[PDB]
Amino acid sequence: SNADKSMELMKTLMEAFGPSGFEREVNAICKEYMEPYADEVVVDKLGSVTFIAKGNDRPRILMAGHTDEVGFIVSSISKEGYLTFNTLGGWWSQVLLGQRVVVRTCKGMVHGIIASKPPHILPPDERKKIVEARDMFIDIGATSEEEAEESGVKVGDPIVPWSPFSVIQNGRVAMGKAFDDRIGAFVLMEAIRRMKDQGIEHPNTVYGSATVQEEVGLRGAQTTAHVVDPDVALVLEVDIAGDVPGKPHEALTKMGKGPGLVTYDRSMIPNQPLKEFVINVAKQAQIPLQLSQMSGGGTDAGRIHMNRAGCPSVVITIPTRHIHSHVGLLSLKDTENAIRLVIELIKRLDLETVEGFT
Amino acid sequence: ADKSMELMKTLMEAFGPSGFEREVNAICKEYMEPYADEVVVDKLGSVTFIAKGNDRPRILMAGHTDEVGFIVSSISKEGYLTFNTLGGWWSQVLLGQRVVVRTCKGMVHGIIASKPPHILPPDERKKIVEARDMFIDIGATSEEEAEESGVKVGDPIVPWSPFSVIQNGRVAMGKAFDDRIGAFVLMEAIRRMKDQGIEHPNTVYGSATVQEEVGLRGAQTTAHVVDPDVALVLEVDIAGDVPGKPHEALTKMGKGPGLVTYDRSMIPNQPLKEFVINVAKQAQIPLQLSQMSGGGTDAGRIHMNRAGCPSVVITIPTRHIHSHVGLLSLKDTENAIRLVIELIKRLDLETVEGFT
Amino acid sequence: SNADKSMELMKTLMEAFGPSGFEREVNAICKEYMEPYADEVVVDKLGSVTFIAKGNDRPRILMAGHTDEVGFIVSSISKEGYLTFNTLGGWWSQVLLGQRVVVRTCKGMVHGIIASKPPHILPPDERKKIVEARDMFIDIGATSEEEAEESGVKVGDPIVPWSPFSVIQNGRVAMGKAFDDRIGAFVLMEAIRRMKDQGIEHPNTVYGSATVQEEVGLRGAQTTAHVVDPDVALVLEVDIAGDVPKPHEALTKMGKGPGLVTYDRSMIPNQPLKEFVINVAKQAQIPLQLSQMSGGGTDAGRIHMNRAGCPSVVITIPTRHIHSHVGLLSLKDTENAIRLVIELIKRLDLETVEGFT
Numbered sequence A: 001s002n003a004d005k006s007m008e009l010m011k012t013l014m015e016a017f018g019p020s021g022f023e024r025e026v027n028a029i030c031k032e033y034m035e036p037y038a039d040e041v042v043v044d045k046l047g048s049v050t051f052i053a054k055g056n057d058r059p060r061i062l063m064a065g066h067t068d069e070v071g072f073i074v075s076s077i078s079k080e081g082y083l084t085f086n087t088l089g090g091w092w093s094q095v096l097l098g099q100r101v102v103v104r105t106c107k108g109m110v111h112g113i114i115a116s117k118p119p120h121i122l123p124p125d126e127r128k129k130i131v132e133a134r135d136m137f138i139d140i141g142a143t144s145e146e147e148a149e150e151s152g153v154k155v156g157d158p159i160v161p162w163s164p165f166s167v168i169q170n171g172r173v174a175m176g177k178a179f180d181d182r183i184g185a186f187v188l189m190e191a192i193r194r195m196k197d198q199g200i201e202h203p204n205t206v207y208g209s210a211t212v213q214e215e216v217g218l219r220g221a222q223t224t225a226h227v228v229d230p231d232v233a234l235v236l237e238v239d240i241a242g243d244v245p246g247k248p249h250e251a252l253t254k255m256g257k258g259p260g261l262v263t264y265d266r267s268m269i270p271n272q273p274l275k276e277f278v279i280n281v282a283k284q285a286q287i288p289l290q291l292s293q294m295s296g297g298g299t300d301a302g303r304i305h306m307n308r309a310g311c312p313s314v315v316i317t318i319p320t321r322h323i324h325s326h327v328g329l330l331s332l333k334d335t336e337n338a339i340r341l342v343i344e345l346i347k348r349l350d351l352e353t354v355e356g357f358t
Numbered sequence B: 001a002d003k004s005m006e007l008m009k010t011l012m013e014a015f016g017p018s019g020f021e022r023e024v025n026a027i028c029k030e031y032m033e034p035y036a037d038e039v040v041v042d043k044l045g046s047v048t049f050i051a052k053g054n055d056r057p058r059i060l061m062a063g064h065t066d067e068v069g070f071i072v073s074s075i076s077k078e079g080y081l082t083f084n085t086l087g088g089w090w091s092q093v094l095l096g097q098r099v100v101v102r103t104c105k106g107m108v109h110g111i112i113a114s115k116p117p118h119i120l121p122p123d124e125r126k127k128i129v130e131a132r133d134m135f136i137d138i139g140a141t142s143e144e145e146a147e148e149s150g151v152k153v154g155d156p157i158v159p160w161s162p163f164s165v166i167q168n169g170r171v172a173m174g175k176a177f178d179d180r181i182g183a184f185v186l187m188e189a190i191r192r193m194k195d196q197g198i199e200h201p202n203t204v205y206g207s208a209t210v211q212e213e214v215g216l217r218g219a220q221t222t223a224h225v226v227d228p229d230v231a232l233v234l235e236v237d238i239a240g241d242v243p244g245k246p247h248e249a250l251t252k253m254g255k256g257p258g259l260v261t262y263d264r265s266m267i268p269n270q271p272l273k274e275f276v277i278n279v280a281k282q283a284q285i286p287l288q289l290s291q292m293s294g295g296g297t298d299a300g301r302i303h304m305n306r307a308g309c310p311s312v313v314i315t316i317p318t319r320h321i322h323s324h325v326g327l328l329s330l331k332d333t334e335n336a337i338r339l340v341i342e343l344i345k346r347l348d349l350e351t352v353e354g355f356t
Numbered sequence C: 001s002n003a004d005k006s007m008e009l010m011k012t013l014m015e016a017f018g019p020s021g022f023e024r025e026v027n028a029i030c031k032e033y034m035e036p037y038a039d040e041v042v043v044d045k046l047g048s049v050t051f052i053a054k055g056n057d058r059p060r061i062l063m064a065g066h067t068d069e070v071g072f073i074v075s076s077i078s079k080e081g082y083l084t085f086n087t088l089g090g091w092w093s094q095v096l097l098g099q100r101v102v103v104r105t106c107k108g109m110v111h112g113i114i115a116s117k118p119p120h121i122l123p124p125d126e127r128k129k130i131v132e133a134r135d136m137f138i139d140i141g142a143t144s145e146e147e148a149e150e151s152g153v154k155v156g157d158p159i160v161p162w163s164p165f166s167v168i169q170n171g172r173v174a175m176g177k178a179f180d181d182r183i184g185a186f187v188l189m190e191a192i193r194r195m196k197d198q199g200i201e202h203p204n205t206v207y208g209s210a211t212v213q214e215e216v217g218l219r220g221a222q223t224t225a226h227v228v229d230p231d232v233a234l235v236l237e238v239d240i241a242g243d244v245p246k247p248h249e250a251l252t253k254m255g256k257g258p259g260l261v262t263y264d265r266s267m268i269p270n271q272p273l274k275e276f277v278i279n280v281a282k283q284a285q286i287p288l289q290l291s292q293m294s295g296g297g298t299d300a301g302r303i304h305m306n307r308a309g310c311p312s313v314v315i316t317i318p319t320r321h322i323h324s325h326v327g328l329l330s331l332k333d334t335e336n337a338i339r340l341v342i343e344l345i346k347r348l349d350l351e352t353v354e355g356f357t
Ligand SMILES: [Co+2]
Pocket: A066, A180, A181, A214, A237, A238
């Protein structure tokens, strides 16, 4: 069953180990799923894998979703057997304490807990203070520097959140980590798969790219854009979903009310003709679409749209609750509609339409 | 063999926050059916297992089976739950954590959440998020969709935290060690005494108390039922293995069970304290002298029962208690079991009267 | 007449003098009203009176409502004729200034006003500061320490708010002091009265108790629980009503029915008993508001811990502005609380009660 194989892919992706800089396990999963569906596979030297579905040489459509997740890296082993760490990507410190993580050593996976000094051994005026991430560490159950070393831990070893994947709300809502942005990778992979399976023709060549190192500076996007030389780009990301009580204007999108379209973000102002194109394609296809704006965040598009002489680009999003944290939620219905939408766009992105954007 | 570890796993994974301990105490009753001579209860929900011997002295061993948790305080119009805490929680360990709510329709999963910091003014992002301003997200999109899951005000909530063993079988990881590990010890002590026909000049009341984390409530009522002549309370100790100091948290995980020499709720009977120290030394069981400047135990109530009851707290050092996931040493646990057996062997009427 | 006699009782209770430790006048009023309705009267040595309506020896149902009210006590007489005072029970300082009080001396009632230093004789930076209760005093119109003494005042003399009882909103809403928790006492007394008057049978013995010293540490509840040895307890209290323009911190609304407390700082209720009350209310079509008091306690905090434990639940009348000179509550809510408690008592037989534990 394909619905099984899809959900099995989703589960495997969200449960895979792949923080920024260490995405090889996740991109291997992507290659394997796509062996029977991509006409060719190209890579960048940072570790981004890109799947090509052939059609007309031009225009080249780049779809990108980053497979790196926010994570950590071992910065030292203390004499008592605790690990210090640096963050990989943007974390809010207040979601870290008490959380389970797993470190990948040469000897395998080692489990631990993010910890700090307990407040009752601090002065009364220091207990009301937020604990900064610089003062946290990871407890792996070791009782000495040696016992810690026996587990295989070395400075520079990568760390991810520990967070199992499941579905809740009677099959409607997915729960787990790394939705940002493996759900975007999931969408582009499923789009390409479906186009082949149902023989859907498209007047263009599609480059579906699982980029690396987005969360640390849009690094894989820059190098993948160089490799591809795209004529138009659809970046798939998550949107911060403002479903939480308290205003509306800072987070327009709601989980379950359809994919989002980003009208402005700190890294890019979208091409306006292309924006209007997506809005219309969605309206015509009756796919609900939420206009969104990310005042203080960026995307792979920030680099892609600046490739060579420029590249018209838009960001399309799945509203997700609690990103950049151990566990988030998103709607499977929104995801499905994002897949539908992207297919409809690709169907209609011929050379003439694309030249009309510039 | 598997049976002990299967019990440990089942206990630490059971649902049982303060006031709602029935599932956990059912697990205890079932494990102990073949080992206890009799079972008495208090009306709060504490179950107590009796291993018979001489009418007097009565030895009370107690470990509380309630865990810190939460309770649903409302459903917001958008489908989020507000909650009150059950027991003492540090707010800084809450955000982003998985919980599970027990409704009339079954278990409902959720995540502790707050307003995201990028929707707040710059000066409010550096502020700690207080628990009063948090809520639980269960994936609902409206007050109704939330109601469909079965949630009602007053429904109990626990942390979601699987049990496993790490460090090559040496260290247990999970929730609710405080104080199901204490319950685990007293149950295993009673089991072993029966299995190996170990005689004891006394009657032993092994009690799985309720509602410790909210005010030592089950201990008071269980003490009334039992009328104990001496009490051994089993608890966890906050383990100071974390970098940065020593004097505020004397105990270390893996260096043996602890003996509490002073806490906010009780100053132990001194003869009894010396007795335990000697029994441990003689039996070659490592024992860490401990002091909990700002915490209490079931003993706080037990030792005040009727005319008084000599009592002492014996502890397993545990890292990260009152949080979703903690760690303790299986070796320490084993030694706590050994120690308690040796004590019970030697607590005859004469020794016990000599404490007072 | 009975509706008159009821309202006359309500008025008399809310207007009676009875701060924590000095509840004798109010408990006398209760004894008098209940002479013709209780089968027996037992007391504790703190001053709690308890009225027994006989039936089956067991189970024993304890209903409790405290008759002490928040108040004050004279802590000194200043050389200028002003009184300093300590609080009896929890008061918010911001509701005290400018308020009328009455002090009970050996010579009788002496009226006064809570006062402080006026802000225009303070430095500019001290006027924006809240006046703490420690810096307040009571003005009784005296001009010297001697003129004050003539009124009969002594250190240790009790003080209550001055606050007449009336009904407003076309007879719907009661206004006055001490609703916490004389309204609870009113309910249990009216329940017992009505059960006798209408010959309503109940498979149990009912102990209706007017406890003392709740507001200073649940003191009368502990000692009354000892005397009674109850098998199940229904504590009647007020609920802070959140009708003022944070829904989750104060769930209850005045006029939307009695409340049922699902959690409070002093007790987590027995769960079977909680479900029982919810169902009895639903079946009897009595509106019932699920409530939670994150930072307050009740007589139940002590009662449920008596001996081996006692399953208990708190039932509440939503009241606005408790622990202040004047509050409001709904007579309709009160009536429904009386109805509810009767329905519960009817159904609390030995078998049901043993099923809670
Ligand atoms: Co992203």
